[model samples]
Target chain A: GMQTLNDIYLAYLDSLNHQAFDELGTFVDDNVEHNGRPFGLSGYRDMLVKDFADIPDLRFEAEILVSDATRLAARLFFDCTPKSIFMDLPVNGRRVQFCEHVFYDFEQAKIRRVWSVLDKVAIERQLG
Target chain B: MQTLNDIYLAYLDSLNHQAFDELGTFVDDNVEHNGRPFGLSGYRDMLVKDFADIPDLRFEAEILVSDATRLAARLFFDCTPKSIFMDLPVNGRRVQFCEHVFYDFEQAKIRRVWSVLDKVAIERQLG
Candidate 1:
């Protein structure tokens, strides 16, 4: 049962990898927040659209997955081909990698809330 | 089995609470880090000993199971706020709240731990 939950959550991550915005939306509840900023499904969709627009070849490699029965924690390395400026630095099409930690709350086979932390400093260093 | 792991983990937490040495020994070998600091074990021992010497404290945690591999713990701390936290500028007696994330290996050893807190607020209050 826990493994099944992991599989579903992993699929949700896969959707983001493929730029399948519509499929990814199904996993987020209507009332969700990113770092305390309310991001309902529409907000989430807009966010992804903007990200993909800037980094068309974005990819994430999840290095670690740890779960029990109700929650999952993932450590990820993100790579993106940047086409626009991010954090005041010109992207210049360089590939960058940074660590991120994501926490997911699951209920009835879907994630209820997701919280994430990214290494912003690492990204800035890459841009420079 | 899960409860056993919880209990062991809780016991470790309690060791920090009581400033009890040798009570918190079960951990991993490249055992994760608090942002790359090596207390590996001796580091932890020195850290706690220093804290106990200063604050004479206790901590209670409100834990939520957020996922299979993750738990978010909110801590309520009761202690005498000291001025020095391992060669840093800190002092006074105060109470503080913090959150921590603990990542454990399959055998229940801590693989890594990450934490964040409002430190300036905490130290400011102490002053």
Candidate 2:
């Protein structure tokens, strides 16, 4: 299943790109935890929704992906123009690119926990 | 193979245990860090000062993905800050932090590096 979870991950991305809010349930757990917050499915959707609202053209681009047995990790790019504050840092309304490295904890075939860290310093340098 | 993870994990352990002498086994002598040209020595110094400041600091590899030539991973550290780090007043307060890092390999050792940490999370805790 080396390519299996990544394909599922792509499908999950499609759900996100389509703004299929409820459809996210197929890939993520109802009790999913993101970062250190218990965002669950709704909080998870809301987070992305706010991102889309702020950036308008925000989209995820996967550069590298790896699968290990039942686990997965990826380096994903967030390339867009933010019209609002991101990570509490004011954006200069310029196109910016940054990445997030995320680790997933899976239960059976669905995602249960996500530990994600984004490059905020990159934003600071660009927006400064 | 998983052997890559094993070797790299041991390298991370070396940093946590303050085994600076063993860094050569895992990294190139001319390794670069985040744009520091041939910066392995500076990397070691940063770790030295880090350990001196936070004796309990540890680098825990959480999620890792590797190919033959490179690896990208996430590292986690939960430690109490005893001094000013990055110009923030983090004195003996427990902060949970994470980093996004990449390593380039040559002759089965790290040759280049890039690392970024989640400072926003720390700022929220500190502010």
Candidate 3:
């Protein structure tokens, strides 16, 4: 069952690669929450679409996927090419790489909440 | 070989049990070399002796496990609050629970370590 959730997340990433916004929305709960922010499924979809538009080739590599019956934690390596300025950083079309740890809360086969930590310095360096 | 390192760490813990000098020697090099105003064998000895004299206790773990890069452990400590801990007397001895994360190098020796503990709550219980 946990493996199924991992598969769902991977598929969601694939949908992003294809710009399949409608398919990506299906993976999120209607009232999905994050950290302390609450958003509906549509709101989450919109955020993803906007982010991908800014970082055209955003991709992630899952380094470690550890999960039990109710909780999942993933150590991920994120990579992207900047198509626009991000966070006051100059975009000279440099490739960026960083690591993050993400935790997901699952219920009834849908992700209810997600928490993530990112390496900011590594990202800024790639903003050359 | 890794097991031997674990055994050494455990033995170090036991030395805290009986107040042995040689038993505490192994940990001195790592603890005293940070240049925070302490070093060499003597520095380590003084620090351990002072800490033990204050707490005068031993710790036991309920669950412990290790992965490739990390060791996660949960421990329960039975302590006698000596005059040195927080400069207060703990009239009623108590059992305290804590968790630690240790990163090892060369399979057995710890290269880096970090710990999370709720000492305030435990001390309140002592009073």
Candidate 4:
């Protein structure tokens, strides 16, 4: 069962990496929350769209992944240059590397809830 | 072995109550934190410093995923700091944030931890 969830999560990542926006519904729940507030599938898709637009080279690299049956945690690493302000920090094309700690709640194999925290401190140090 | 989840909860309880004498019962003698070789004493020292800096510091896991030998948690904190925290200019202001932490266990005790805190949340509040 854990292996199944891992495979499903990997496929979800594949969809995101390939920019298959339409296929996201297969991996994400219709009623989803990004951090805590409700961000339905449409809103969640929009957030990803904006993310890609801001960082053309953005990629989700799972450094560490821990999963049970219904919940999973991931440490995602990013090494890319942002074309715009990232999290209110001026990163105008400067290469930055940081990681996000994200946890997901899966409902019937679809991601229903997500709580994520990014390493802004790492980014700030790189900007120095 | 006791369930890893239960052991983890007990460890958190010890920390929340400042049970420094009992940390050895929960952590390995040679534990590593964030990939650095910090022994059990070093780990305790770090927590001690944290409590001293944030008198009202507490650990509440918002999300917990535990297996036989590993545990991952999104620990939440809402407290005031007496000084700067994690390089953020928090000063004496109160802040709420979460930390994503993964723990590796050895013989029912914590052997390693990889953790990251949400500094942007604090920065936004200060700004």
- Number of backbone-clashing residue pairs for each candidate, in the order shown: 16, 1, 0, 0
Q: For candidate 1 chain B, which ten residues in a row score worst on lDDT?
A: B115-124
Shift of residue B113 alpha carbon in model 1, Å? 4.9
Quote model 3's TM-score: 0.51
TM per candidate comes to 0.64, 0.83, 0.51, 0.94
> Candidate 1 DockQ score?
0.18
CAPRI class of candidate 1: incorrect
- Model 4 lDDT, full chain set: 0.90
The Cα error of candidate 2 at residue B62, in Å, is: 4.7
Tens digit of per-residue lDDT, candidate 4, span A85-104: 99889999999998888899
Instruction: For residues A1-128, write the lDDT of model 1, one tens digit per residue.
Output: 54576687778778988888767656877776654568777887788788788888877667666565776666777777778776446767888876666667676666666666555556666665
Question: Which wins on DockQ, candidate 1 or candidate 2?
Answer: 2
Q: What is the TM-score of chain B alone in each candidate?
A: 0.66, 0.91, 0.58, 0.97
Best first by lDDT, ranked = 4, 2, 1, 3
Runs in model 1 lying further than 4 Å from the true structure: A1-3, A81-94, A124-128, B1-20, B34-39, B45-102, B106-108, B111-127
What is candidate 2's lDDT per residue for A1-128, written digit by digit as tens?
55478888888878888878778888988998988688788898898888789888877777766676676777788888999777787784888888887878788678898877788878877876
Better of 3 and 4 by TM-score: 4
The top-ranked prediction according to lDDT is: 4
Model 1 lDDT at residue B40: 55
